[PDB]
Amino acid sequence: TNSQEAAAKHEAQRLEQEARGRLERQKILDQSEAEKARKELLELEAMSM
Amino acid sequence: AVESTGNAKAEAESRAEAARIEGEGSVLQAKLKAQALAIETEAELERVK
């Protein structure tokens, strides 16, 4: 049962790992789209200045 | 890139604008200055003659 404990623990740690990496990848995607919108906004801003 | 090129383009075109207005303005003002010096040196040359 202790082996089951370590197994479930390491398993939850694994899903936590995949969840963190996935959500981080999601941050990167949002940062990308935000970078593009920020770029077009920089077009309007540079033209403004 | 778009930001820095944008601001630099703005300041540079500003200098181009000032250079252009200074240009044509220098042309017209130099022309009126030309007529002024002309009539002045003309009457001066007459009375001095």
From Swiss-Prot, chain A:
Cystine crosslinks: none
Modification comment: Phosphorylated on Tyr residues after EGF stimulation.
Crosslink (Glycyl lysine isopeptide (Lys-Gly) (interchain with G-Cter in SUMO2)) position: 39
Subcellular location: Cytoplasm; Nucleus
Record remark: domains: MVP 3 mediates interaction with PTEN.
Record's function text: Required for normal vault structure. Vaults are multi-subunit structures that may act as scaffolds for proteins involved in signal transduction. Vaults may also play a role in nucleo-cytoplasmic transport. Down-regulates IFNG-mediated STAT1 signaling and subsequent activation of JAK. Down-regulates SRC activity and signaling through MAP kinases.
Quaternary structure and partners: The vault ribonucleoprotein particle is a huge (400 A x 670 A) cage structure of 12.9 MDa. It consists of a dimer of half-vaults, with each half-vault comprising 39 identical major vault protein (MVP) chains, PARP4 and one or more vault RNAs (vRNAs). Interacts with TEP1. Interacts with PTEN and activated MAPK1. The phosphorylated protein interacts with the SH2 domains of PTPN11 and SRC. Interacts with APEX1. May interact with ZNF540.
Protein name: Major vault protein
Natural source organism: Rattus norvegicus
Lineage: Eukaryota, Metazoa, Chordata, Craniata, Vertebrata
Range covered out of full length: 666 to 714 of 861
